[PDB]
């Protein structure tokens, strides 16, 4: 059992969903029509990949996923795309009018019209579960749906499913691909509203991903397609422990124990390696030591920040492919005597390690080289607060003049919600500061 239900909200959530589920299918040998030849138990099973796929009597493996967007044109492409047979039509939910980069419309005006239908379809997946573990929620910070509707959904999910675990993959805005001037507003509002209702959230800085595509894959002007294929690899690495089995395999929930010292401190920093082109990977093998050392190059992080100027509260290494503990231990011992790695004084310094022997996979016609071994580091660093600081500053610049605020007030919101949300962010920045101070 231990089923996980994925919920993809808004354009960013949906399109990243497309990348992830395409990638999962290739990893598990699932065809676009949903058939899986290697799977001999027809109509059901207790295998590890069943945490993410349900099975029909006809042998179809169906994603435990819901796609939601307040406008139809993004999900329509799924309905008519390569993997359209993969999803039951009821898993793909669309309204007629989007939130127009407005949190208020996503949470209230437009969102309230479809929220009940969404919860009903989610309920239908959950009742098929024999032991539901929790939810994985994909969304942008900047969009009106990604911000507004997500926070509404997360609130409602806490009511309907109690303390059942809820994880986030949140797309943090970058100006190179930004769509709205008000994305700082939407970011602060959804972060404030979802904070109590999320157990663990993996932020993905679009600029971090943008830079990696430019620097490591030599993509002059990365598209969402370039970004999402890279993002899906990090997501795959994180969910791999749920979808595969193995002796040295460590469940994501075990890492979670280490990553979250306090409820509000639940934002791990992700760092992935190797990201390399076919051209460069040719006749060049990246060893365990090399990819592990790459995890401490800030250029490889999913979020722009400097952990070297912060303190660690946890360090997890999630390997996949040709990797054995001996090489990991050797690589770690080398790194600790050469990197700027400093822990807070109230936490142990040991690195927690997981290994999935299933090697990395790449999507056809993709920019990433196929490698024998990869690693995703999940660390809890005070430095990730830098991402909050940058967003909060941009928020302050506009809110001081109340720029664009009338678009929110016009949809029923009050200025008190802005100030309340900003105060919570200030407390959160202070929290990350407090945990880094030495004990008395």
């Amino acid at each position: 059992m231990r089923e996980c239900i994925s919920i993809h909200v808004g354009q960013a959530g949906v399109q990243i969903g497309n990348a992830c589920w395409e990638l999962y299918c290739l990893e598990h040998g699932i065809q676009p029509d949903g058939q899986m030849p290697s799977d001999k138990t027809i109509g059901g099973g207790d295998d590890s990949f069943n945490t993410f796929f349900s099975e029909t009597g006809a042998g179809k493996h169906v994603p435990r996923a819901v796609f939601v967007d307040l406008e139809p044109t993004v999900i329509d492409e799924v309905r008519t795309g390569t993997y359209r047979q993969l999803f039951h039509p009821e898993q793909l939910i669309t309204g007629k009018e989007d939130a127009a980069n407005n949190y208020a419309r996503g949470h209230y005006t437009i969102g309230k019209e479809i929220i009940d239908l969404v919860l009903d379809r989610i309920r239908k997946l959950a009742d098929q579960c024999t032991g539901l573990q929790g939810f994985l929620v994909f969304h942008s910070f900047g969009g009106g749906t990604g911000s507004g509707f997500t926070s509404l959904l997360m609130e409602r999910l806490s009511v309907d499913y109690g303390k059942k675990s809820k994880l986030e993959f949140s797309i943090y805005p970058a100006p190179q691909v930004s769509t709205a001037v008000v994305e700082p507003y939407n970011s602060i509002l959804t972060t404030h509203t979802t904070l109590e209702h999320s157990d663990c959230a993996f932020m993905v800085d679009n600029e971090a991903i943008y830079d990696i595509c430019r620097r490591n894959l030599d993509i002059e002007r990365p598209t969402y397609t370039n970004l999402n294929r890279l993002i899906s690899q990090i997501v795959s690495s994180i969910t791999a422990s749920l979808r595969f089995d193995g002796a040295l395999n460590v469940d994501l929930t075990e890492f979670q124990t280490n990553l979250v010292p306090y409820p509000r401190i639940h934002f791990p920093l992700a760092t992935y390696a190797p990201v390399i082109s076919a051209e460069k990977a040719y006749h060049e093998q990246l060893s365990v030591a090399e990819i592990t050392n790459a995890c401490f190059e800030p250029a490889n992080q999913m979020v722009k920040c400097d952990p070297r100027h912060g303190k660690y509260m946890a360090c997890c290494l999630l390997y996949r492919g040709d990797v054995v503990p001996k090489d990991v231990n050797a690589a770690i011992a080398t790194i600790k005597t050469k990197r700027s790695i400093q822990f807070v004084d109230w936490c142990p310094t040991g690195f927690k390690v997981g290994i999935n022997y299933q090697p990395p996979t790449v999507v056809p016609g993709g920019d990433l080289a196929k490698v024998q071994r990869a690693v995703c580091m999940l660390s809890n660093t005070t430095a990730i607060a830098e991402a909050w600081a940058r967003l909060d500053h941009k928020f302050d610049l506009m809110y001081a003049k109340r720029a664009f605020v009338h678009w929110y007030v016009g949809e029923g919101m009050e200025e008190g919600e802005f100030s309340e949300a900003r105060e919570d962010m200030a407390a959160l920045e202070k929290d990350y500061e407090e945990v880094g101070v030495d004990s008395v």
Partner: protein, 427 residues
């Protein structure tokens, strides 16, 4: 005098299975449950651990417990997986998430009654039940949290029976999660009150032995469990084979425990060997005696020279000169008499058993009640305090209904235990 065995959680079931594997071979019992041995010594007291079944089949008096089916499914498909009574497999589905509270108060409380039904069913078959032995870790959720819950409830229903445990202590050198010191401290509190005998099996010591002594660059849990199964076989030898000394769990307790709370033992073993690595040279008796007393052979990462022995039980196995044994045993005490308390006369007792373990022509198992064990609890207390002073990772516990006060009490009681051990070190 029957013993009821219980194994709880991942660690508990993994060493528990290995234990039944090892002693089944010693008693000539195959995975089918059939006897195929050449000595009658093997069957004389086989009733202590095994129930007799149809076709003269022997079935372990063992109860397997976990809050998830993973590890127990591995046991059932393991080497001697079929020997176990299938009805004695009692498992939940939710797991404990390395959380003491989940094992003790919520998830485990839901399952514990089912376990006690099996314990009770086994106990009434017993002609004269002497007690229980539990195998578990203290660093996780099930074995630590639910295991101590089981102990408390067994004591309620069998308050005049002996409770014994093999308790694996957590170590940062071999660590799954950061909250192991929390789980362990809460568990030690339970153990101090509700067991008569606890074998402290330190993962720190097991790691160091594998690395420093056995020259294993990167030891696994499988390697660590080679040492545990070897130790467990030895400390139960006097219970499984005919003899006059420490033959039941109560007489062992009366000889090993001068004060009720001070019942945490350091196990030792010689010769130390790694898996597969064949030994060709049999140790002399002086060598066995010297090694079994050396810190490098202790299964608890404590320096015995930093404390004093209250009581000692030693068991030599194999074909040897019992006169040479008594000579060497007397020499250790007479050469290092300072490390034995003078106010317990003749506190070292020795047994001998003709049957050696598998692969060795002779061996010695050590069971010491030393005040030096405080170093183990002090170590846990320091790791506990480092996090607790900032109330770090506590939300995992308060979320299951626990209050901070309960941590404070557990902390205080373990520090009391430490000071009690210190009291007799300077007597």
């Amino acid at each position: 005098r029957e013993i009821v065995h219980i194994q709880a959680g991942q660690c508990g079931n993994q060493i528990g299975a290995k234990f039944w594997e090892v002693i089944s071979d010693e008693h000539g019992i195959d995975p089918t449950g059939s006897y195929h041995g050449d000595s009658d010594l093997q069957l004389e007291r086989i009733n202590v651990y095994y129930n007799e079944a149809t076709g003269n089949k022997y079935v372990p008096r063992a109860i397997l417990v976990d809050l998830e089916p993973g590890t127990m499914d591995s046991v059932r498909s393991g080497p001697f997986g079929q020997i176990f009574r299938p009805d004695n497999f009692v498992f939940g589905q939710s797991g404990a998430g390395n959380n003491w509270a989940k094992g003790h108060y919520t998830e485990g409380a839901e399952l514990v009654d089912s376990v006690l039904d099996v314990v009770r069913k086994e106990s009434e078959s017993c002609d004269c039940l002497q007690g229980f032995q539990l195998t578990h870790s203290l660093g996780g959720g099930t074995g630590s949290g639910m295991g101590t819950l089981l102990i408390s409830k067994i004591r309620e229903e069998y308050p005049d029976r002996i409770m014994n445990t093999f308790s694996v202590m957590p170590s940062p050198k071999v660590s799954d999660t950061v909250v192991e010191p929390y789980n362990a401290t809460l568990s030690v509190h339970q153990l101090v009150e509700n067991t008569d005998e606890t074998y402290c099996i330190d993962n720190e010591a097991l790691y160091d032995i594998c690395f420093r002594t056995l020259k294993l660059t990167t030891p696994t849990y499988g390697d660590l469990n080679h040492l545990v199964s070897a130790t467990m076989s030895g400390v139960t030898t006097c219970l499984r084979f005919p003899g006059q000394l420490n033959a039941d769990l109560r007489k062992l307790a009366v000889n090993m425990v001068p004060f009720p709370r001070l019942h945490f033992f350091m196990p030792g073993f010689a010769p130390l060997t790694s898996r597969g690595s064949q030994q060709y040279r049999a140790l002399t008796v002086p060598e066995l005696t010297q090694q079994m007393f050396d810190s490098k052979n202790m299964m608890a990462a404590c320096d015995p020279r930093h404390g004093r022995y209250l009581t000692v039980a030693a068991i030599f196995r194999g074909r040897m000169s019992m006169k040479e044994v008594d000579e060497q045993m007397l020499n250790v005490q007479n050469k290092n008499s300072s490390y034995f308390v003078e106010w317990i006369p003749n506190n070292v007792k020795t047994a001998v058993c003709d049957i050696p373990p598998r692969g060795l022509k002779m061996s010695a198992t050590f069971i010491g009640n030393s005040t030096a064990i405080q170093e183990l609890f002090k170590r846990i207390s320091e790791q506990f305090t480092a996090m607790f002073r900032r109330k770090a990772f506590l939300h995992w516990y308060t979320g299951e209904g626990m209050d901070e006060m309960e941590f404070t009490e557990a902390e205080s009681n373990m520090n009391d235990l430490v000071s009690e051990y210190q009291q007799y070190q300077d007597a």
